[PDB]
Design a protein around this nucleic acid. Sequence first.
RNA 1: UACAGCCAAGGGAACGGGCUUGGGCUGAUCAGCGGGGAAAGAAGACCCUGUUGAGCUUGACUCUAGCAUGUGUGAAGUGCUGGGUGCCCAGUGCUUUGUGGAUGGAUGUGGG
RNA 2: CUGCGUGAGCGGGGGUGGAGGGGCGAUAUGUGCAGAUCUUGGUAGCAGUAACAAGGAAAUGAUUUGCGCUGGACGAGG
RNA 3: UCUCUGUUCACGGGAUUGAUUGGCAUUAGCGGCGAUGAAGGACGUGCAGGAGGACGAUAUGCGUUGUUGUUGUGACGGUGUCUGAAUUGUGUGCGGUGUGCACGGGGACCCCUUGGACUUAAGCAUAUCAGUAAAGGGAGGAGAAGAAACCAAAUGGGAUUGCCUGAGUAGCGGCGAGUGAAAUGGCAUGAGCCUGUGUGGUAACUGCGUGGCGGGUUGUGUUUGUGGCAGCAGCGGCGAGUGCGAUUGAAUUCGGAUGCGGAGAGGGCGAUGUGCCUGUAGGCGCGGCGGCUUUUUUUGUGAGUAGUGUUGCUUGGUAGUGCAGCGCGAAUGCGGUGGUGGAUGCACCGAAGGCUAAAUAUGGCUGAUGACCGAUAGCGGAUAAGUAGAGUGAUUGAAGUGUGAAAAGGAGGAUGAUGAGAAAUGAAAGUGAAUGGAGUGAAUGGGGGAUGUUCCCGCCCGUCUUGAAACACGGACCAAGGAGACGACGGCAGGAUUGUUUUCCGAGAGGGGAGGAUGCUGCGGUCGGACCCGAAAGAUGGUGAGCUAUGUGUGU
Lengths: 142, 224, 50, 59, 51, 108, 86
Amino acid sequence: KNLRKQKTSSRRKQRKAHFACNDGEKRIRSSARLSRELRKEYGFRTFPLRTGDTVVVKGGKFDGKEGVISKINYRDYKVYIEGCFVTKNDGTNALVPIYPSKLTITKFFLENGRKEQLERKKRAREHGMEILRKRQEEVVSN
Amino acid sequence: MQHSAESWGTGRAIARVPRVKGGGTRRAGQGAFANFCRKGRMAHPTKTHRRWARKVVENTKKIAEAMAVAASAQASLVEARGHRISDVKMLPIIVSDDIAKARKTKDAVEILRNLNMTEELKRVEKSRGVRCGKGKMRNRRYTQRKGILIVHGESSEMLGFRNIRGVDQMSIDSLDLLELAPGGVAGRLIIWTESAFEKLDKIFGGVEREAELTPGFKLPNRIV
Amino acid sequence: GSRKTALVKTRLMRALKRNREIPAWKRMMKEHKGEYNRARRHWRSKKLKI
Amino acid sequence: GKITRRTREAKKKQRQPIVKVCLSYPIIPQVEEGEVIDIVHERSRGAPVAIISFKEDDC
Amino acid sequence: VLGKVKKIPVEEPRLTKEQKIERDLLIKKKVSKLANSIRIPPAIYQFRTVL
Amino acid sequence: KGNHALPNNHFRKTSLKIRIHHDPETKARVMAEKKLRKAKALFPMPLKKLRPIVRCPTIKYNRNERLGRGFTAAECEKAGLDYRHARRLGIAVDLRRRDTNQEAFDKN
Amino acid sequence: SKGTASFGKKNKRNTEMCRRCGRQSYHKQKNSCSSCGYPNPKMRNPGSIKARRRRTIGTGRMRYMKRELRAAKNGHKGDPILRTLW
RNA sequence: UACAGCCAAGGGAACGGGCUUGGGCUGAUCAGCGGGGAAAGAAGACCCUGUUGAGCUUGACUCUAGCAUGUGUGAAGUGCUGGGUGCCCAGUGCUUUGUGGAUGGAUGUGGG
RNA sequence: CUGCGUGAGCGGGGGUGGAGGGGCGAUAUGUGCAGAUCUUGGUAGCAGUAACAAGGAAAUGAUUUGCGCUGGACGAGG
RNA sequence: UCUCUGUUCACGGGAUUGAUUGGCAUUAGCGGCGAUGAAGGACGUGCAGGAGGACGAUAUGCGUUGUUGUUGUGACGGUGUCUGAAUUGUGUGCGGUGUGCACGGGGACCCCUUGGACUUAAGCAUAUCAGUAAAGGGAGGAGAAGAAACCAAAUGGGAUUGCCUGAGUAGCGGCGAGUGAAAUGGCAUGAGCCUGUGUGGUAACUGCGUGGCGGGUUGUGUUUGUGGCAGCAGCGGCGAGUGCGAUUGAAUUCGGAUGCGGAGAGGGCGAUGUGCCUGUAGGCGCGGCGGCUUUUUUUGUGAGUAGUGUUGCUUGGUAGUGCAGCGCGAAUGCGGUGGUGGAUGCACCGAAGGCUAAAUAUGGCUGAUGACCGAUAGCGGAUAAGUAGAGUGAUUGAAGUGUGAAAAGGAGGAUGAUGAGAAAUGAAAGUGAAUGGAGUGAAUGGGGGAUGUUCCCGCCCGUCUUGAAACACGGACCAAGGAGACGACGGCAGGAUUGUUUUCCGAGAGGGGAGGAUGCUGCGGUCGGACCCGAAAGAUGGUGAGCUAUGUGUGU
Ligand SMILES: [Zn+2]
């Protein structure tokens, strides 16, 4: 019951697939982009997020801050970062939720089997960039 | 009409419309079925077998396509309906058939700046926006002006002209009226290739000589 | 009455342990505030029909 | 119209009949000897009924 | 259905593998006696003469 | 009322039904894909059979010819062939038709 | 006294819960359900147009028919152990 | 519950709160009361009209369940008395080896 | 609040509001309300009126005293 | 103070503007249940749980495999209390005591049986509505039909099924109202076979079993696909290209730059988007499931049938168009048919046994679309809706969407805090407070003049009617909804394109030259629910003797 590769271009069907998909698809729609200096080691652009990653905010009142993710809520599209808070009417602090597509990944987390997820996708991309080169260079003759 | 409603008749000091049967709910005793009752049906319901299309005389269809082709060479008509042209050499515009070798979009955009069609593709870009009333939520959200039309004579399509915002394509063997005179007003800006431009005397013929590739058709004669 | 069949007794028991309000630990949550059970029955107004 | 009383009283009696006991005596070609063991009243009859006992049969 | 009594089907009792055999031979006798009490044509009666 | 032709519109039956296909352009091209898919499942053999030339019956259509159903067993025999073997070579055979004209017999 | 006073005599109950359909419509003196027709082997013809859409295929749980529909999309392969015998 | 609320005459769809020409209590309360508002309630049940119904009757028109009476179908073999011209039929007893459950059409009757 | 128009109607200014809105030509219509004992929802007058309740008391009330007549069990129904 | 009337602030109510994970329509595929226990019902399962949803004693979920570190989830496999056809049964085949099959669910579309009335005829009985609705039995992804005992009248065509023409025609019909074909011609799709008389130098045949048993001479006669060819659906993964300045609570706005494009479809993100994310164009990888595809020599037949007298139904079928009951009941160089009863020529065909793709129909499910509706609309149902509730029962059946970008926070009052903003917008009817003016006259209106009035004129609208201010009927007040649109066939007017147009009279026998066609808009005519709302009735299929009436068993 995955829905993010729908053929339809109907507005009601697309908003329905964003707000009501399963939790597996909520994580891929919560994807972030890598920095320039981290995108020279791995070849790819965006990768999804988890706790422990270091990011940087871009736009809003926390524009320019940097911190570590302390909690994620995939179902509601909410990320909590250490250092972006507010004081309630009691003296206490609370963390503010941010939307995942306004962050940039720098120095992610590599401990619970995540070092291999990055290496599997780095191989699939360079294998796919050669099917395109062989086709292109031969279609160069085409 | 999904009730067993019946009128109560006269003698009870209420009007004669039919009314819901039952008890124990606020629906019980209210009006039903009539076009002036809440939750009723329409007086004359809309039906699926009304006529949606119309028939055009076949010869008048071809007279209209020939007027639209004729008006694409008057510079006063092509500038009346937009189409900013101050730097084209002459109308009509004809290029060779070797633009089909531009299969990357980066090259097709270079061919179009060489023909001085540059400030035309900028006018279409800046006209795009959201539609005003209720149609925006019926899958019709953006609108924009019409741009250039490329009439070629090759097969399915030119892949390198397909992404440009403000460019259409049409085959010489189709030649439809809905692309030639958009909105019903003639005078679009058309670019011909040299193979397509030479087939124009067989499709339309003359005023006193019949056309081959279209049996019977002759241009209409003049009344003044 | 005191006399009743076995099938009448087990449906009266099921109806009995249904007539209850939302528990307090669920109402105290952040995203369940302002919620009451609203499917409640009082033995004088509405009858069960055996 | 509706159905007359005569016809309904006939239908009530096939549903809930009046029953009498069917008196009769058996076949015995040789001269035997009986024995009146009782004389009794019966519902729906006016005549009393006798119970007579033979060597291998009652009537 | 208008003050009447019911339809009362029958579905009479069934024979059990020895009443049936007892019922087949009753029919074979009743039918054989009718075949010898009416006049028998010549082409069927000639088979009553064997070696 | 008025001077008009007498009308004869038959809509007095409630059981009557209306029938419309609202998109005959997509229905034609879905049937041309079916037709090209049979053709390359029979690939070498051409999906249509050879049919004869016949003559329209009455005095109104007397002077007109037409494609017919099939050839006869005598037309197949004189062309050097058996009608059981003409059917394996893509030729249609009709054993109901009779032979009564010598010119038409020769065209076929 | 056919109105209010006659309502105080209505304390006998003619029906009980039906063991096929679960409504209070099994008439005990008649031995018959007025909703579904039990104990006839077939179910009764519904009495109205709306009655057909209150109790049909899909208004309950469909505990088996859902499973069978997921199996017919994959060709009815069964338990992977037993597949050797087949 | 159109809006309102004091009378005489006139004319008016021939008994006006309002129209025309005259006569007038009393500045805003409380308790009573049954002249008027042709007071309220209910698309007059009486009466007429409609090419609108239904309960019931019979000597209305057209039909029909049931019932009566000839006649076709059904089971084989025999005797007997009578009709007309050798003939077809009537009753008819007997024998056992079919069966009694029915079924087609015709005339009469039929406010159930 | 103010200008224009014989009229159906169309403009401008100051508050409020917090996201979209129009002109002109052709074309498609479920295209304009005071009434139908019209439909659904809300609200007046009548009117703080009709109707109903205010059960004998003793500063207190597990104490003292005054009045009424159903009282106690099994079944149906809950 | 009270009554009426200006102004400002506060109420009361939920119209309006703008949104929408809902509805509705057309189109392409599919049409997948059950004795191997279904659909439906009852009761249960979470450490802390009511509704809903999910699940079955392996119970708020277990195994394998993919993706994940998470309140985790996708694809497939297993389990499934007590019930229910509910069966430890009833019927029946093969065997000879073993082992099969049928039953229920659903029924839009299809086949067979049975079979109305409303309605139209301005009344009504034949007729019409209509062999239609309702009821019952039997099937499938379609079904049924089908390879001439045909059509016809030429120099002849050549199985079934669908569409256009033929044609509102030939005809049937209180010859009234009405009703109503086909062949030919033009298209789509195309395909033909099996059997009851098969050896006699030996049943050459097959259900069960491992060289045998059962059947069969009253007659059996049944090899073969991990191979090829064509197609259809699904799953997984890779997927190009960005930075400054001003305004803002926040920018996708405005102003300079710099890139991608077989990708400028659509959606989200604090607001209006080609380089912020998801996808998109386009390549790769992996299952699965079907269709075609193997051909030893064979000759001959269809009976309680066809037909026919009588009776009933049906069709355009007119003197059977077709079907059925009862009775009679055929032929073998023979039998059947040719739009009027019978005769005779000539023409054309072989019934009474069996099977057969494709082109056609259609609730629901899944994909893709739209000049459709936008909370009194659209499905009854945008929410714990066939729910809450009503009825003995069959049945019946609603009302209810919105704090904010962020919970950053309130909820008797007062004092305050946060926020861009106290927080969707907030009409009329009606009301409270303050303040200006007027009054003891029913009020309200027009002319002419004026910071209220003084003079003149002025009875309450809509409707039926010869005639209404009426002692004629409807109308307390406000908002929203609310009625000549659509289809078929003909005529005329205006307009568009083209123009080398015409099968005549007459019942017949006979006689014989004389500018339209195809669309578009409007109006008049007829049949359709037919401008909108309204009877007393008639028919088909089902529910009730807990009130009340009579009989009967057993108590007081
Ligand atoms: Zn039941």
